[PDB]
Amino acid sequence: AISFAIAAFGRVKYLDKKLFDRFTRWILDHSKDLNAAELLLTIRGVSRVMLLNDQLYDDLGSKAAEKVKEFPIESQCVLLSSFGSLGVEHERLASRMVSSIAENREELTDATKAVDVITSLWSMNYDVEDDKHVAQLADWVVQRAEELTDESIGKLCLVLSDTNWRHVPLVRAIAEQSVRLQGQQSISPKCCREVLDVLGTFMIHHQGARENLSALGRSISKERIQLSEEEEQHLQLLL
Amino acid sequence: VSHLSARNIATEALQMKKLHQERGGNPMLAQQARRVLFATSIAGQNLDARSVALLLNTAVYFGMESDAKLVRECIDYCLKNDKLITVDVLPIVVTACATLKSRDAREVIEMQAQKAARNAKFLDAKDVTNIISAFSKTGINHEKLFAFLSRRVQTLARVGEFEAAHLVILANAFSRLRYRDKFLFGAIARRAMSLRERVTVNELVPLIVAFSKIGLKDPKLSKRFATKAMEYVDQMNAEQVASMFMAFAYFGIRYDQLFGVLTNRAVELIDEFNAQYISTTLNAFQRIGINNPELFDNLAERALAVVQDHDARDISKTVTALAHFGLKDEELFKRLASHAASIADQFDAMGLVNTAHAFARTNFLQQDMAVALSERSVYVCRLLDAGETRRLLWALAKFQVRDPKILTPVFNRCLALHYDFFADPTGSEEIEEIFDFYGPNFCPPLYQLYIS
Amino acid sequence: LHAFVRSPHYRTIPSAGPNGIVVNRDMLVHQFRDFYKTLQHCSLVDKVHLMSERPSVEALRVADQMVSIGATFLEMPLTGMEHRATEFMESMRYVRGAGGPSTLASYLQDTENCRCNSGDVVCLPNGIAVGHGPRTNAVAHTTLKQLFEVKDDQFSFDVFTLEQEGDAPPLGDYFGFAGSNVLLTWKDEHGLLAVDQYQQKQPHTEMNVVYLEPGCHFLSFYGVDHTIDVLVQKGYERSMDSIAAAGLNPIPVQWSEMDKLGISMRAAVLPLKFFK
Amino acid sequence: DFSHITRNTVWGLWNEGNLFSLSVPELAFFLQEHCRVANVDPRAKKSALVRQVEEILSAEQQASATVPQEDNPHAIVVTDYEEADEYGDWGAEPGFEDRRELDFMELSPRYDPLSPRAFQLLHSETATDVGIASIDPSKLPGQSKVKNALAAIHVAPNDANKMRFRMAFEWCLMNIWNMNMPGELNIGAGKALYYRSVAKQNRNVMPLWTVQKHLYAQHPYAWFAIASESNVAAMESLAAALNMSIQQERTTSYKVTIRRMAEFFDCELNGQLKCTMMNKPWDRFFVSHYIRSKMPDLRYVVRARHPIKKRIADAYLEADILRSTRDSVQSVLSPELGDVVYCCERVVRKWAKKTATGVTLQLVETKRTPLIITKAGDEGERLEYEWIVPLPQQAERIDIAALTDELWEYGNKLAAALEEGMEELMVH
Amino acid sequence: LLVSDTAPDVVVSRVNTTAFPGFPSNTECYTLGASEKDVAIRSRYSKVLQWCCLNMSNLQMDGELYVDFGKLLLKPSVMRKNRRIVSSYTLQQRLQVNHPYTWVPTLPESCLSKIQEQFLQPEGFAPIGKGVQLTYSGTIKRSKDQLHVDLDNKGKVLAVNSAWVNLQTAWCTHAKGPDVRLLLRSRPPIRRQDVELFASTPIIKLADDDVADVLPPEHGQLVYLSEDETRLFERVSDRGVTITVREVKRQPLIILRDEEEDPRVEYSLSAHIPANAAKATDVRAVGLTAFELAGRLAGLVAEDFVREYGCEAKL
Amino acid sequence: NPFEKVARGIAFKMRSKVHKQGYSNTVMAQQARRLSPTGLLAMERLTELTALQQRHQCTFDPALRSKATQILRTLPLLSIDEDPYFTHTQRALRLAAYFGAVDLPVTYALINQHTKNAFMLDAFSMASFFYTLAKLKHPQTKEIVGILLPRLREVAPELIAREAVHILRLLCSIQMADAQLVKVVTETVVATAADVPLRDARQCAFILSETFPEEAQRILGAVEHRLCDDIDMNADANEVKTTILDVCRVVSATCKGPRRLLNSVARRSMELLPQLTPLDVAFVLKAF
């Protein structure tokens, strides 16, 4: 009736200040005896109402890191995204929690969840050039880089551009998947702009991707002055 | 022990403002935003420049002043952290700290002016127009900044770099700012002229209004604007009709064909007249002198229908304009007199004396407004100038008012300002009237001062 | 994708430039605005910014200060350019106005002894070309070898030191490059020598070559975007047909008077890449 | 229910989102009396009544509270073609009193001529300054234990004017000492005639603050210096009253403004017609107008001169021909050294003494005959009177308050000397 | 905050200057001049009163005008750095943060012989009702607000109202004589359950000489109670306005703070402005009349206020 | 008409400008926050008194009370409406309680402050005040309780049961308890019978069984089923023995008993035969 109430409040964003203060004080007083499937029900509820507390989040993160095997895969993804949304950072939680998602990689529904986990891990101020678990996630995304979509490609391009990640095979896969997506007219100009931007920053030619995405990518960045027909005919006379 | 994440709060406030502005604005969104933002407090967090300007902008938008904690906390970090402000976020802060009445809300602007004065050269078109629009509303009159920005605008306008949406903003901001320059306005007019057929009527009338508001200009400019106005009369409603008609009247050039076509097209939308801007289109005729009676009767016929909307200024200006071309139609005049008597509580000195003078001119005197205006005159007789005092005194004279409490202050004021009172030749006959109506008994000093 | 140009000074523009032919002061100003319109329409540059006026006509060369090879910039060494260093300061402002400072070429400007000129370094698909002649030293080539070099199956980047004679103009003036494996070259001794030097390097490039009559100024940029267009002087007609036969759309622009001034396409604009 | 539930209470509850903290009869009474509903079934629970009250309140609310913080075209307004808060009565302005002591002067944030860096309007009849004084409230019924209590008392305008003058003078002294420019002080007699466009809103009565800001911003004013000959002998009596001593007799000088395409300069050709001084125009650092009821008004000016390398001055010296004999300016200048803009004959008569403070005090009478002038049509004979006093150096340890008071009283004495000396024309 | 003998305004004027060589046209001539003393003060006061009354009537409330005679005393907090000339705006802004004013209402009693000789009857002031009425005035500090109780001579409560709130405050000072502090007041609502409750429980018990407090602790606390001898005079100036003069020779009995332990006789003038003056009644006229007729009574008692009782050394 | 709309907007904007976050209101609030000149020394005295409580509670050393009772002999801590929560007053009262300070004038002054400011006390503060004043067997508890009792009926329906138990113990040990707050406490207990410790319910049913039997009967009937389930499913002998003994005592005192509870108590008393003391058997049989 505290975890249930907190989850019910955080699922609809009706934070009540003093009541939540008393709730936090209570769950701080008795914290060492919270069973699993209740930390997940309170972290999301208290993070969806935008409460920035340090001691409470520290305690909940430590408790969740202690009990890792009980949480299933989707619970792991949601618990990472909950911390990721606000911007708070916890090294122990991420380090202990990405190992399970790396070991149980094969049970993921597709690579979109993998790129979402990588993005949420980036948002938490965790080094993405760390131990080979992130490398395993990236290689798995590369091997099955056919289920990606516009949003996943955009987020991954943002992560690579910000983090300065030199790992090329995923960039080649991104270029090829952008080409294939444009082949069926199911891409957005912003995604083309982002992939062209990361390609230009990382100095990869990939003429096939450069050719067919140029018209889509130039239509968002090129600022065009609206000219009247008289100036149009003057230009026609000029050139 | 518990705060709110100010960055996500700013994002939610941005979404709330976007939803409130684009849907109609039910007060629920305003109350929700105020409730959320009241508890928000910038603190030992590390908000960057954008996340502070966004919060300040939304807070001022949703009806907050220096009373709120957030506004006071957000006006700081700008007093002390000035280098963080960039050209992208300068107009937001500058126009946010404009309607605020705090002293600290007027120092910030000063600093911004300096940081713009040396940077009016290294800007593009959009930044220049945004900065000019932001600084127009505040009210500062830094001359060096305006000179630099005028130069930059002139340089940018040499080769076409302004879409047909920023010329209106620039002209309106300069006209409201009360700063005049032949070269800048000529360049703006030329650039607007180059973009033929791109400027619609909805984007043309405001330019004419802005140019007319600085009407101290030369011909050959409104001459060309008359040509363009020929083909934009069809698809425009009564509001721009009246506004551009007042603008052309203030230009001071007789456009017989333009006035004729405006009169011809104006009668179709006589129904759309809300009687609020009828005062301007009536007064502009008095300003120029055109006495076409057909549209005058058409306007007067649409009066009783809408009188509640009429305000004190509207009634005063309408009666003053109707003084010339005196129809003296009692049916409208009784209702207008009663309505103005109800409104007579809120009025203006100069307006008070014009209303009294016009009522005396029309020779329609009823007890209610007469006594009401005589009562309300005393509070404003203190500050009227010579001719205005004379007109008010003659208005009371026509009103047949003998109450000592009313005549004593005006007589004292005219005694203290006898030299200017007796120095007006055009009003001379008027003074004549007053004494031979009243007599010599009231003010003996005025007696022997006149007899001199 | 960011291009910078400077408007000329009408009062201090000199007639009879260093070639014995007088010039028309009004005609420069007349042609500059049409050049601006063509540049902002030609779809080769994302944005154009109009720099302020300055007295010296030698300040009309917006380039020769700072070269863009990638996300980072490279300022040029101060050697014989001190007399106008002041105006250089102003230029940077406009750059920083809408862009970051990048690396500031600390590594290049402070490289002991340096002799570099904007135009000796020309980018190419997975390649850089340095015109080793009377303007660029081998130390600059070694520094670029240190900085912009990566070697792998996909991290493939190369640097080509091209030899040229003492009387040859800067590298970027005559032999240039346009996207989609098309290489533009003058049909003179300098152009043939440059083409041969490039051919002896990396035979697997498979670069088609199109020839133009000597004395033609043209502007063409690799860019992150791919485009088929070139800017050519509205003089020699045969070059337009020669380049259009290969599937490249040409765009003519008038530079007679400024050619007599001695100002080329490379120094008329300043290309830059701005990222986030 | 009863009368305690009113429109204000329900409005506050609605704005704080706590309407459910009310009983059913209260809501029924509010709907039946304030909202004026037809009838309500006495069975509805809290939700229906709350929703009805809320909808009625929102529908009848039409006073927009939002202010658009954005720019938008297509908007037509005719308005042009703080005052209540000017007196500071409708609240407590937050963040007040936390500013530098610049209440008595208008300071806005380099060399520039005709650019007052600090304006201070003053008056003798009208002064906007109240005073405080001590009293003994022991008699009063309740204050039988406090010995001192302050009360607000009005003050004489002259004392307030002197206080503001010295408050500005100490600031000016500190500033000029920090800059270390050559300091000069001028006290001129003349009329400060203003222009008609000063009156904003086309009003007559206005507080001193608004007119001070308007003068400091728009500058719709002009200073005119004029005296009379008939008072000369009279002020000679003042000389006998103040033991003035002649340090220079009547001297003929040719004042010229040697302008240039880059900067401006001035010179004083002598009777022999050579250029013996080269200097920049004066820098107006502080201006104060003391307006009296009658004609004689006073202008207090603090000005300094910026330094210049003597190399260029020596390059100029007398190389520029400036001969203006035969009433014709035959100044054969080089093609691009500069130009001559204005020229006037000054007849100079000055006295001297040593003040009690210990600074030289020069009284000069100057008769002006403008011969060559381009910016305006000045002509005729004009007589001006003024005091020059150079400010004491920073290291002279000269006390400041007594010096300022003595200067103010000496200006008052000069005003009184020619107070009846300008009785010729009917000024007022 | 208003001080007499003030003139914070400037007057526009123009003159004919035909003896100045150079620009002799009088069109470009502008000059400054002085003004009168009372007009600015009266205009500002009337404007602020009109705005405040309009706002109060806009908020659907009722209020009354009040005029009181006494003296103004300020704590040494307002004075700073031994300065004696302060801007009026600065003083008004400084007296709005901590309320350091210590107004104490009083008036010497040896003037009633000439008080009736102030044109009371000629204006319309007449003695109505019964004089020398004995009553008690007390205040209760509840959990959230304050309440005021009027007790009869017997001990029965007469009226139980709420604490007063002042909307418009005016502190027009004066010369060596007394100064006037014109005010506008409104009365907040009160639950009539609490009104009825404070009628059965006894508040005071009146012995032969001494008076005692019996209020139960649960209901509140007695913090100030005093004995009042009251009499009334009334005037109507053919306009429906009821200008009322009241007399209170109060002797405090039960006090809490320290600065009220002395007998005090004071005067009071009042009117009535219901919630309909926003449309029909001229509000500013009543304020102007009250300010005009308060100056007379200030002038008449100005002498004895400093002659034998009191000392006002304004220097 | 437009002027009236403008006036409405301006008036309501100015009204909305006034709230609890205003600068002037904050300034007055912080002015009220300022402590008195004697307040600082009162806090120092409280800190000095607190510094010795742990030493006396641990070492049990003598002569520590000396110079510690005298320092509190003259305690000018009054704080009239400076702390409208009495937390410092409660702290001082508890400190005097632990030191044996009962008849000193400081304690009487504190109690006088309590009885004179008895219109802003909430449920928690009054429950804490009645928790003490019972450890301190003051000679004049009757008058204090008589004065404070009319406030009890106002803040009664906000008391935890664990403090209502002690409230009723104090009120019934002096025969002053009235049948006006007892019904309120009984209503609260019977309403919150779903989740309330069984020990508290048993104590509340037993304590008022002598005087008011029907309320105790209703309290027992509210938790009969839970008590039966507890006495059946529990394992430890001591707690079940205490529970059956107490419920048997309550049933015997009230002269009435529910059927199911008696059946469960019967079977449990059969299972607990070895640990049954003779008095346990006597009381179990007496209950029937």
Tell me the shortest Cα–Cα distance from D291 to chain B, in angstroms.
21
Question: Which chain E residue has its CA at the smallest distance from F147's CA?
Answer: E217
Determine which helix (DSSP H) or strand (DSSP E) holds B249, and give its type and residue range: helix B238-251
Q: Give the integer Cα–Cα distance in Å for C62 and C81.
A: 13
The answer for C105, left when phi > 0, alpha when psi is -120 to 50, beta otherwise, is left
Q: Is D347 helix (H, G, I), strand (E, B) or coil?
A: strand
Which subunits sit against E, judged by 3+ Cβ pairs under 8 A? B, D, F
Q: Which residues of E touch B348 (CB under 8 A)?
A: none
* Of B174, B239, B254, residue with least CA distance to B201: B239
Residue of D61, D78, D218 lying closest to B27 (CB–CB): D61
- Nearest-neighbour CA in chain F from B343: distance (Å): 9
Q: Do A153 and A195 meet the contact criterion of CB atoms below 8 Å apart?
A: yes
CA torsion C92-C95-C100-C105 (nearest 10°) is -50
Whether F9 and D92 lie within 8 Å, measured CB to CB: no
Q: Does the annotation list D346 as a binding residue?
A: yes
Token digits for A123?
């948002």
CA–CA separation, D365 and D236 (whole Å): 11
* F5 neighbourhood in chain B, CB within 8 Å: none
Give CA–CA dist C108/C96, Å, rounded: 19
Rounded-to-integer distance, Cα F38 and Cα D196, Å: 65
* Distance of alpha carbon D63 from alpha carbon F14, whole angstroms: 13
Tell me how many residue pairs between chain E and chain F have CB atoms under 8 A apart.
36
Query: What residues have CB less than 8 Å from D100, skipping those under 6 apart?
Result: none
The whole-angstrom separation of Cα F96 and Cα F73 is 10
For residue B120, the distance in angstroms to the closest alpha carbon of chain D comes to: 17
Task: Kindly give the pairing relationship between strand C182-186 and strand C158-163.
Answer: unpaired
Cβ-contact E161, E147 below 8 angstroms: yes
Rounded alpha-carbon distances, angstroms, from residue E168 to B198, E145, E186, F56, F162? 57, 21, 10, 61, 53
Task: Give resolution in angstroms.
Answer: 3.7
Residue D99 assigned to a binding site: no
Beta-carbon-side half-sphere exposure of residue E61 (alpha carbons within 13 Å): 20
Contact between E97 and F27 using a beta-carbon 8 Å cutoff: yes
Sign (positive/negative) of CA torsion F129, F134, F136, F141? positive
Q: What are phi and psi of B244, to 5 degrees?
A: -65, -25
Between CA F60 and CA E121 the distance in angstroms is 86
C-beta contacts of F282-286 below 8 A and 24+ residues apart: F283/F245, F283/F248, F283/F249, F283/F252, F284/F244, F284/F245, F284/F248, F286/F248, F286/F252
Chain D touched by F28 (CB under 8 Å) = no
Q: Report the first-to-last Cα separation within chain E, whole angstroms.
A: 19
F9 touches chain D (CB under 8 A): yes
Q: How far apart are CA B88 and CA B106, in angstroms?
A: 21
D413 annotated as belonging to a binding site for a ligand = no
Does B228 touch chain A if contact means CB atoms closer than 8 Å?
A: no
Instruction: Give the Å distances, CA to CA, from C240 to C38, C232, C249.
Output: 17, 8, 9
CB contact under 8 A, E17 and D378: no
To the question of whether residue D303 is assigned a binding role by annotation, the answer is yes
Which chain F residue has the Cα nearest residue E145? F120
d(CA F28, CA E169) in angstroms, rounded, equals 18
What is the CA B165 to chain-centroid distance, rounded?
22
Q: Burial letters for E55-78: b for 16+ Cβ neighbours within 10 Å, e otherwise?
A: bbbbbebebbbbbbbbbbbbbeeb
- Class of residue D37 by CB neighbours under 10 A (exposed 0-12, middle 13-18, buried 19+): middle
Q: Are the C-beta atoms of residues F204 and F182 closer than 8 Å to each other?
A: no
Whether D227 contacts D421, CB under 8 Å? yes
Residues composing chain B: 452
Distance from CA of B308 to the nearest CA of F (A): 6
Tokens of D306: 């910026």
Interior angle at CA D422, CA D418 and CA D425, nearest 5:
175
D165 in Cβ contact with D404 (< 8 Å):
yes
Chain centroid offset of residue A1 CA: 32
Question: Residue B207 CA to chain centroid, in angstroms?
Answer: 16
What residues form DSSP beta bridges with D134?
Answer: D150
d(CA B395, CA B358) in angstroms, rounded, equals 9
What CA–CA distances, in Å, run from B198 to B153, B192, B202, B230?
Answer: 20, 9, 11, 16
Q: Do B281 and B245 touch, CB atoms closer than 8 A?
A: yes
Amino acid symbol at B349: A
Q: What is residue A96's three-state secondary structure?
A: helix
Quickly list DSSP for chain F: -HHHHHHHHHHHHHHHT-STT-HHHHHHHHHHHPPPHHHHHHHHHHHHHHHHHHHHHHH--TTSSTTTSSTTTS-----TTTSTT-HHHHHHHHHHHHTT--SSHHHHHHHHHHHHSTTS--HHHHHHHHHSSSSS--TTHHHHHHHHHHHHHHHGGG--HHHHHHHHHHHHHTT---TTTHHHHHHHHHHT-SS--HHHHHHHHHHTTTT-HHHHHHHHHHSHHHHHHHHHH---HHHHHHHHHHHHHHHHHHT---HHHHHHHHHHHHHTTTT--HHHHHHHHHH-
How many angstroms separate the CA atoms of E241 and E218, rounded?
A: 43
User: Using the beta-carbon criterion (under 8 Å), do A52 and B3 form an inter-chain contact?
Assistant: yes
C-alpha distances (whole Å) from A1 to each of A8, B126, F138 are 10, 56, 43
Residue D14, number of CB atoms within 10 A of its CB? 17
Rounded Cα gap, residues B93 and B95, in angstroms: 6
D51 annotated to bind ligand: no
| Cβ contacts of C93 on chain B, cutoff 8 Å | 122
Please tell me whether D350 is known to bind a ligand: no
SS3 string, D187-224, reads EEEEEEEECHHHCHHHCCCECHHHHHHHHHHHCCEEEE
d(Cα E216, Cα E197) in Å, to the nearest integer?
Answer: 12
Contact C261, C9 (CB under 8 A): no
CA distance B107 to B78: 10
Q: Do B159 and C37 touch (CB under 8 A)?
A: yes
AA letter at A13: K
**D81 contact residues in B (CB cutoff 8 A):** 212-213, 215, 250
What the block records as the tokens of E96 is 């709005």
Contact exists between B and E (3 or more beta carbon pairs < 8 Å):
yes
CA–CA distance, E188 with E172 (Å, rounded to integer): 26
Residue B423 structure tokens: 């120095």
Interface E:F, ≥3 CB–CB pairs < 8 Å? yes
D213 known member of a binding site: no
State the DSSP H helix or E strand holding residue D373, giving kind and residue range, or none if neither.
Answer: strand D362-373
**DSSP letters of D261-327?**
SS-B-BEEE-TT------BPPPEEEEEEEEE-SSS-EEEEEEEE-----HHHHHHHTTTS-----TT
Helix (H) or strand (E) holding C243: helix C237-244
Task: Tell me how far the alpha carbon of residue B285 is from its chain's centroid.
Answer: 19
Q: Do E259 and D142 touch (CB under 8 A)?
A: yes
Q: Which residues contact E201 (CB under 8 A, 6 or more apart)?
A: E215, E216, E219
For C253, the closest chain A residue by CA position comes to A239
Mind giving me the DSSP string for chain E?
---SS----BEEE-----S-SS---STT-BEEE---SHHHHHHHHHHHHHHHHHHHHHTT--EEEEEEEEE--B-TTS--TT--EE-HHHHHHHTTSS--B--EE---STTHHHHTTTTHHHHT-EE-S-SSEEEEEEEEE-SSSEEEEEE-SSS-EEEEEEPPEEEEE-----SSS-EE--EEEE-----HHHHHHTTTS--EEE-SS-EEE---TTT--EEEEEEEEEEEEEEE-SSS-EEEEEEEEEEEEE-SSSTT-S-EEEEEEE--B-TTTTTSS-HHHHHHHHHHHHHHHHHHTTTHHHHTS------
CB D422 within 8 A of CB D385: no
Place of tokens 């003004």: E35
How many helices (H) and strands (E) would you count in chain B? 25, 0
Q: How far is residue A47's CA from residue A81's CA, in Å, rounded to a whole number?
A: 10
Centre a 10 Å sphere on the Cβ of residue D182 and count the other Cβ atoms it contains: 12
User: Going from the N-terminus, what domains does chain C have, and what CATH number goes with each?
Assistant: 2-272 (3.75.10.10)
**Chains A, C: CB contacts under 8 A, how many?**
57
Nearest to B102 by CA among B56, B50, B62, B37: B56
Quick one: D367 exposed, middle or buried, by C-beta within 10 A (0-12, 13-18, 19+)?
Answer: middle
Q: How far apart are CA D127 and CA E34, in angstroms?
A: 10
Q: Is there a contact between B375 and E284 if contact means CB atoms under 8 Å apart? A: no
With CB atoms and an 8 Å threshold, state whether B383 touches D203.
yes
- CA distance readout (Å), D81 to A55, B213, B250: 62, 6, 9
Of F2, F3, F22, which is closest to B67 when you measure between CB atoms?
F22
Question: What are the beta bridge partners of residue E140?
Answer: E147, E222
User: Which residues of A sit within 8 Å Cβ distance of B?
Assistant: 17, 20-21, 24, 50-53, 86-87, 225-231
Among residues B57, B162, B243, the alpha carbon closest in space to that of D74 is found at: B243
Burial class (CB in 10 A: 0-12, 13-18, 19+), B100: buried
Contact between F3 and B312 using a beta-carbon 8 Å cutoff? yes
Residues of chain B in contact with residue F21, where contact means CB-CB under 8 angstroms, are 38, 67-69
In degrees to the nearest 10, what's the CA dihedral of D92, D95, D98, D99? -100
Is the CB of residue E215 less than 8 Å from the CB of residue E97? no
d(CA D419, CA D124) in angstroms, rounded, equals: 15
Cβ neighbours of residue C161 closer than 8 Å, sequence gap 6 or more: C130, C132, C138, C141
Question: Are the CB atoms for E19 and E36 separated by under 8 Å?
Answer: no
C-alpha–C-alpha distance, residues B85 and B91, integer Å: 10
Task: Report DSSP state, residue C53.
Answer: P
Work out the number of other CB atoms within 10 angstroms of the CB of residue D428: 12
CA distance D152 to chain B (A): 26
Which region, left, alpha or beta, applies to residue B439 given φ > 0 means left and ψ of -120 to 50 means alpha? left
User: Considering CB atoms only, which of E55, E97, E217 is closest to F118?
Assistant: E217
Question: What gap in Å lies between CA A30 and CA E267, rounded to an integer?
Answer: 67
What three-state secondary structure class fits B335? helix
Across the interface, which of E43, E279, E282 has its CB nearest the CB of B382?
E43
Q: Are E104 and E73 in contact (CB under 8 A)?
A: yes
Q: What is the radius of gyration, based on Cα positions, of chain B?
A: 28
